[PDB]
């Protein structure tokens with residue numbers, strides 16, 4: 001409840017995910033959200049994004065031998081969320097301490113030198129309130145930048161700068 | 172016991188490192204070597220590299236609350252090697268899979284667009300040879316890029332292209 | 343040209359096993375390994391363990407109606423691995439979710455209040471390393487207690503405790 | 514991912530070996546393997562074959578004044594490999610020509626009028642492949658029977674005929 005919805009996420013089958021092999025569960029309501037980037041190419045259409053989400057997965061599963069793409073959800077510059085490991089499965093995105101207690105969402109692109117467009121930002125915002133509404137995320141969830149829990153440049157200077165201002169951001 | 176056997180590393184205390192509190196050990200002889208870059212700025216004097224080593228440790232220890240700098244050794248463009256957690260102590264540089272069974276060496280800089288100078292490449296090779304000589308690494312140890320084991324651009328394209336040519340490189 | 347190498351196993355006919363009727367194949371390479379005990383009488387002679395294997399197979403096939411012994415491999419305290427369904431055929435040891443995606447090995451005996459002697463531990467670990475060598479296991483494979491994937495005391499408190507220390511264990 | 518040793522060798526300490534005193538290093542990769550019998554009592558349980566290694570070692574050490582058991586490894590009718598001098602400590606099993614250029618393995622019992630069990634033979638073949646894998650034995654290695662290289666009836670007639678069928682055997 002409320003039955004109304006969450007909605008507007010591209011399902012795995014629809015971007016043609018390879019089947020996941022992951023079996024580890026997050027405990028809902030999940031306290032933490034970690035915001036990463038692909039550091040990769042971005043994509044501004046559902047056709048390229050679905051392909052991009054695909055490439056990201058191919059890296060993690062094929063090259064790295066992982067169970068599935070590492071993130072719970074991915075965000076496109078086309079303004080749409082891509083189902084990754086989803087609300088219920090532990091991602092592989094922020095280390096053995098943050099993985100079991102957070103949702104990892106990754107913007108598809110390199111935001112060291114670019115700001116992700118407004119619609120990508122809206123998509124992430126709506127995805128998170130989506131999560132609250134479902135009970136997947138605590139009403140007072142905390143948003144962390146990837147670099148805050150792991151040594152890395154992601155989510156990129158520009159993007160890290162933007163999230164730092166979000167309501168649910170925590171030092 | 173007679174002096175003839177490798178060495179010349181800038182010791183922790185010399186670069187002024189904070190006391191490590193990491194207790195977790197590796198098992199010699201170690202099979203795997205993971206090459207990373209700091210992804211931040213670079214330095215080309217013992218002056219600046221000692222300082223920079225300090226910065227990287229500060230971030231991992233002060234910001235991330237880690238027991239020590241995540242790397243086992245750092246490589247400066249001054250051509251010197253900076254003692255991180257060293258041969259014996261499990262670091263935090265490539266995930267719960269690679270960390271207990273590798274030695275993480277990080278070049279201080281960003282090699283997406285730039286190559287480390289010869290003296291930096293020699294410092295790192297020579298270090299490895301020294302690790303073999305000591306029985307800290309296997310005689311047939313394997314080198315991998317960060318990006319071969321974790322999803323990241325590290326250790327930067329240019330540097331990645333070089334480690335790939337190494338005698339001990341195995342993707 | 344044979345398949346190399348790897349490890350030593352007591353064949354089906356050597357422990358006088360009934361012919362298997364199982365046909366459903368596992369998809370190589372397998373990501374998971376599940377460790378159980380049989381909660382059966384234990385054994386410490388080659389002869390006494392071949393006998394126990396027959397008893398366990400006998401229970402599975404005659405009373406449970408399975409196509410063969412449920413386990414892929416069994417372990418005796420005699421230090422020997424007994425071949426069950428083997429690397430290629432799906433076992434019945436861990437519920438319909440895990441059976442299609444795992445290798446189940448089972449230590450013959452009850453491990454609530456006993457330890458398996460070091461030789462059984464060695465065989466089990468070598469069996470696994472050799473599953474990897476063959477490409478029947480993945481290199482980044484993961485071992486799980488039976489109790490981690492089903493509500494059961496299996497593989498016994500003592501032995502569960504033991505297998506938590508393994509390189510490859512993921513809860 | 515993962516330690517430690519192939520061929521599931523019973524370590525010297527587990528059979529209660531008196532401490533070794535040998536020091537002559539063997540020059541791996543070793544070209545020859547030499548197969549013998551002990552001409553001693555045989556044994557069929559890991560307990561009786563511990564005792565028997567012990568009995569052989571004691572003869573060599575206490576009686577013959579040797580630094581350690583003559584054999585690099587011993588093979589039991591229990592089906593296990595008993596560590597003697599190992600891969601790098603040059604053995605005393607085949608005399609001044611063969612000791613420095615072969616690895617010597619001995620089956621525990623007399624094999625003039627009987628054969629060792631299939632598991633005993635499996636364990637040796639395993640052991641050998643575990644040797645090549647370690648770069649202890651060279652890939653293209655030759656196997657000789659004790660008699661091919663020394664005036665003795667060892668390894669026993671029945672055991673001799675079997676090893677002549679080994680892919681790697683050379684008269």
Ligand SMILES: CCCCCCCCCCCCCCCCCC(=O)O
Pocket residue numbers: 467468471472474475514515516517518519520646647
């Ligand atoms: C292929 C997976 C490697 C796992 C090695 C564990 C089992 C021991 C070896 C059996 C197959 C690979 C041989 C190399 C093992 C060397 C380990 C060591 O020296 O400590």
